[PDB]
Amino acid sequence: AGSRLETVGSIFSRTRDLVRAGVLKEKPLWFDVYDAFPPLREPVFQRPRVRYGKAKAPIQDIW
Amino acid sequence: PKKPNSANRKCCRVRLSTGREAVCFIPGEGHTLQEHQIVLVEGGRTQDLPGVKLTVVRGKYDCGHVQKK
Amino acid sequence: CPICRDHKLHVDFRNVKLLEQFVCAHTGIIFYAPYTGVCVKQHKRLTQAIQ
Amino acid sequence: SFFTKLTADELWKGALAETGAGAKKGRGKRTKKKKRKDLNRGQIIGEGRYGFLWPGLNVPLMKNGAVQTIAQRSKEEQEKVEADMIQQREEWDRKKKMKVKRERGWSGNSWGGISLGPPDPGPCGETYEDFDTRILEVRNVFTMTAKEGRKKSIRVLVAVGNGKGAAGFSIGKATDRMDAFRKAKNRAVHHLHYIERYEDHTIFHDISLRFKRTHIKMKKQPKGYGLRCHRAIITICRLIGIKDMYAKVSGSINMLSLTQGLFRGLSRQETHQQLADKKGLHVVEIREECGPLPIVVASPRGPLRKDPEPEDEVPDVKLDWEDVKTAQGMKRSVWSNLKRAAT
Amino acid sequence: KNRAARVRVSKGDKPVTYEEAHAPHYIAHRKGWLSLHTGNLDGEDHAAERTVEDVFLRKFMWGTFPGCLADQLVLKRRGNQLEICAVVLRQLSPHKYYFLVGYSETLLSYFYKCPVRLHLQTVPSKVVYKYL
Amino acid sequence: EDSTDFNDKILNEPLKHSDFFNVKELFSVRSLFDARVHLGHKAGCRHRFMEPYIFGSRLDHDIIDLEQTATHLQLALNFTAHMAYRKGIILFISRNRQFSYLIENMARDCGEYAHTRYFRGGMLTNARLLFGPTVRLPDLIIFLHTLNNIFEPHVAVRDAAKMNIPTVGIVDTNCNPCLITYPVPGNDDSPLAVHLYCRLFQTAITRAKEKRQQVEALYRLQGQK
RNA sequence: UUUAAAUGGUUGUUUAUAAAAAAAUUUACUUAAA
RNA sequence: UAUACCGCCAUCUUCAGCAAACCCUGAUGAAGGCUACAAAGUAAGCGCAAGUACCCACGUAAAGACGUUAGGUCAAGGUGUAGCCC
Ligand SMILES: [K+]
Ligand SMILES: [K+]
Ligand SMILES: [K+]
Ligand SMILES: [Mg+2]
Ligand SMILES: [Mg+2]
Ligand SMILES: [Mg+2]
Ligand SMILES: [Mg+2]
Ligand SMILES: [Mg+2]
Ligand SMILES: [Mg+2]
Ligand SMILES: [Mg+2]
Ligand SMILES: [Mg+2]
Ligand SMILES: [Mg+2]
Ligand SMILES: [Mg+2]
Ligand SMILES: [Mg+2]
Ligand SMILES: [Mg+2]
Question: Closest ligand to B7 CA?
Fold first, then answer.
């Protein structure tokens, strides 16, 4: 099957849970590589928000 | 009746034991009620007839049961 | 009801496996009649047989 | 005249009146909608009213190794053949009159809670026989077109689940109700959630959530409690595999908001292991039925912190008045805790 | 809108034969005539009697071979001979076909006082030209 | 009986080493700096999700931190090699028309696939209708440029996540890396930078495919005797 | 920016499943006798 | 009884749209789905078109979908329902 809910979790968590639940009969070719060498950040969808009030970006000027 | 219905619904005006006079719907097919007769009325509005909020009870005092077919 | 529709189900204090179906396994309370749909007559007989 | 006779297809097309102005814009609704009967069904070639036996057509060509000659059934023999034919028709007609018992959903004439069966197998020899489908809503939506005016469409909400944590829902739209069912059923299996069940029977913690204007408050319950929630939530819970839970739906009771809100809350629950790992502490379960026994349900896979979590004297938590009001015996309701069938 | 002999579009699930798929303005362009005789040629006689005979024969064969015909008849007339060409199905037993061919050829020869032959061509199923 | 041994010696063996394909030697922080990988867009073009990767703003020009680029690139090149070693279909996607010819050559040279053209709706989520019921979708998608030509995320980023296909992507300071599996913060405009990315990913893929052939051959020669 | 131009009786315009089956004929002269 | 219908048609049409099956968007609402230096659509089938008839590739015929007007026709013929049968 597979889950096309790209805004819920990541491709890893969705694949792991579906293989775990018995929906996906075989793990995809990439799964074992991700599990061994995962990325620094789990790719989860986030919504970009504008900064209001006193919220400022932490980027500093290089001098 | 009011829209979208059309009929000639048999009603009567009674003087209630409280002294008030109200219009009461007579249910069933065929009624033999005449003036000065005694009836028992109950609640329940006639959804068609605006303002008729009382119903005559069939089979009490003078108002008899509807005659079979 | 479930008891009256099958004439071979006998509500007896010895038919422990049938009586167990009408008791909660986790709490041990006898289900009230609306739970299973047994008529009042059979629920009374079931309660007495369970006791 | 023999030359004015038409064929069966032409006769039935006229008599049935399936294509006409009466059916274009909900103009004529007739309970006595005529049904087509094939009158050639039971007819045998060569059988007539006179009862002649034609060798090689009605009867076998050769009998006893000799060619049969033209014969005619006797009067009484033909009567039996004609009587049997009437009996066969009545039996066939009887079969069609019989009504098959349909398992009703939430109501007799409601589509909610009726099973649509397993999702259809995928093109690549893929099967979903484990999954069960159940309808949640069937709505007759309408749009306006320049040519035809009111254009009727069917919107169908269906949920699917295998009963072991994997469940999903989708909306299907089509002019025909069957097409809407199929589209929704097949699309739902491609949009599956995985729901974390505590001990494979309940939720890990109480979830309070508002999706748009619909509020859902779910409570974790012990085994044997059953499903004491909105009929739609009961249906979804059976597909997910949750056996014990309580839920109160407030605000708008929109079915699409409820379903989307339920899956949003259940998907975002924190398991006991995730809590132990995040906090670096043991998660110890205290059960009244087990006295003071400390049951460790989860331990931190990584290093275990040595500082105890700071115990705030007074918790600054937002309490729901309805919960507090019930705990103080201030909530009377003639509709609460009513005896109901096993769910 | 014109209606004559036009099988109208459905959902793409109605199988039509090649003859049924072509409207009347194709009768000398993409499809031919289902009957060939001399009645309708210039200076020829008896067009009326040929027409009645064709109408009867198409009715006769429809009822004589009920459920067997897979497409329309092709009636051919050469001199005194009448030849009926029918595309039938492969459901009825061959014995019943031979009986009906011997019966129809004899009965029709005595009815129209001419030698009549019936040429059957069997197909496993109706030949679908397109799905309308 | 033989399948499990084959899989262990070939498929599971490389997954036990931190850098099986030695991709760390392909690049250094100096080489990345000389390719202008650290040059980001102006601060007014900054995406909020790229702030963790930005070293700072030099006169309103965001400078990408190459020390994080190096760690992110190491993981991306490692993942790419393992997928090529496993005979995975790798698809290069980019809508930057200055580099469409370069990227399409790089894919053909390493025996992989490139999609540098207008991405038609449903290429990934409706593939079985577009290509055929038995079509095999890519196992990895490498975005050399993650933005389309209206400065918005390439539709394939969302659709790759829908289809559960891992994605490698060069994410400049104006890009959204939230759905890219292996983001590599770096300049995606300068030819020198794009030429380096193409050299690095082409080498890692070529190296991995040859290693798969060497390992299989050794296993087979030993198997007979 | 820029002439005038009123009217159109009442009620009616949207949901529950689908579809029959059959059966065989049963391989090679002439003849005769009591 | 054309307001039960088949059949044959008028009308917009001196139109170019109708649309199964999928995919995606709108927080999974009624609904919506294009930009070519392209940004989510792919689209069987039907109509247009193309072909064919007439004296040409022109023109004229023919053709002209889905629907609109419960449009016309129970009096071409057939036919559902109801009615008549000294
Ligand atoms: K009314
Ligand atoms: K009315
Ligand atoms: K009639
Ligand atoms: Mg009342
Ligand atoms: Mg009911
Ligand atoms: Mg016309
Ligand atoms: Mg850039
Ligand atoms: Mg006026
Ligand atoms: Mg008006
Ligand atoms: Mg009409
Ligand atoms: Mg022309
Ligand atoms: Mg014309
Ligand atoms: Mg044309
Ligand atoms: Mg009319
Ligand atoms: Mg008229």
Answer: 1
Q: Is residue D183 within 8 Å of residue D227, measured between CB atoms?
A: no
The span from the CA of B6 to the CA of D5, in Å, is 47
Query: Is D128's CB within 8 Å of A1's CB?
Result: yes
Which of D222, D224, D342 is closest, CB to CB, to C36? Answer: D342
> Which DSSP helix (H) or strand (E) runs through F73?
helix F66-85
Among D222, D223, D339, beta carbon nearest to C34: D339
Alpha-carbon distance F119 to F132, whole Å?
A: 18
Please name every residue paired with C27 in a beta bridge, in sequence order, or none if there are none: none
**What is the count of structural domains for chain F?**
1
Per the CB < 8 A criterion, the answer to whether F187 and F193 are in contact is yes
* Amino acid sitting at position F165: I
Q: Which residue range forms the structural domain that includes residue F146?
A: 3-222
DSSP per position, C9-43 = ----TT-HHHHHTTB-TTT-PBPPHHHHT--HHHH
Nearest to D200 by CA among A20, A7, C36, A4: A20
Torsion of CA D222, D226, D231, D233, to 10 degrees: 40
Sign of the dihedral through C-alpha E13, E14, E15, E16: negative
CA pair distance E72, E58, nearest whole angstrom: 8
- For D125, counting Cβ atoms within 10 Å of its Cβ (0-12 exposed, 13-18 middle, 19+ buried), the class is exposed
Q: Which nucleotide is nearest to D22 (CA to C1')?
A: H70
Q: Encoding tokens for residue D326?
A: 């019930």
- On whether the CB atoms of residues F2 and F158 are closer than 8 A, the answer is no
Residue D224, judged by CB atoms within 10 A of its CB (0-12, 13-18, 19+), counts as middle
E126 to E6, E15, E33, E62, E82: CA distances (angstroms):
19, 9, 20, 16, 25
φ, ψ (nearest 5 deg) of residue E87: -95, 110
Positive or negative torsion for Cα D80, D86, D91, D92 = positive
Q: Where are the beta strands (DSSP E) in chain F?
A: 39-42, 54-57, 61-64, 90-93, 113-115, 140-143, 167-171, 182-185
Is F183's CB within 8 Å of A60's CB? no
List D residues 199-238 in contact with F (Cβ-Cβ < 8 A): none
Tokens 């769910």 belong to residue: D343
Exposed e or buried b per residue across C27-43, where buried means at least 16 C-beta atoms within 10 angstroms of its C-beta: eeeebebebbebeeebb
Ligand 6 center–CA D16 separation, angstroms = 28
Q: Which secondary-structure segment (H or E) carries F34? A: helix F29-34
Residues of D in contact with C27 (CB under 8 A): 224
**For chain D, first and last CA: distance in Å?**
68
**CA C19, C20, C23 angle in degrees (round to 5)?**
100
Q: Which of A3, F125, A12, F122 is nearest to D191 (CA)?
A: A3
Q: Return d(Cα D179, Cα D200) in angstroms, integer.
A: 35
**E10 CA – H17 C1', rounded, Å:** 17
Chain E stretch 20-59, residues whose beta carbon is closer than 8 A to a beta carbon of chain D: 55-56, 59
What are F's interface residues with A at a Cβ cutoff of 8 A?
11-12, 15, 43, 46-49, 51, 54-58, 62-63, 71-72, 75, 78-79, 82-83, 86, 88, 125, 139-140, 158, 161-167, 176, 178-183
Judged by DSSP in three states, D177 sits in helix
Q: How far apart are CA D184 and CA F84, in angstroms?
A: 38
Query: Considering Cα of D38, then D42, then D47, then D48, what sign does the dihedral take?
Result: negative
Q: Out of D126, D130, D191, whose CB is closest to A5?
A: D191
Cα–Cα distance measured from residue F136 to residue F113, given in angstroms and rounded to the nearest whole number: 13
Residue with the two structure tokens 């601060």: F43
Expressed in Å, this structure's resolution amounts to 2.2
The spacing between the Cα labelled CA in A48 and the C1' in H41, in angstroms, equals 27
Amino acid at B19: G
Which residue type is seen at B16?
Answer: L
The ligand whose atoms approach the alpha carbon of B42 most closely is 4
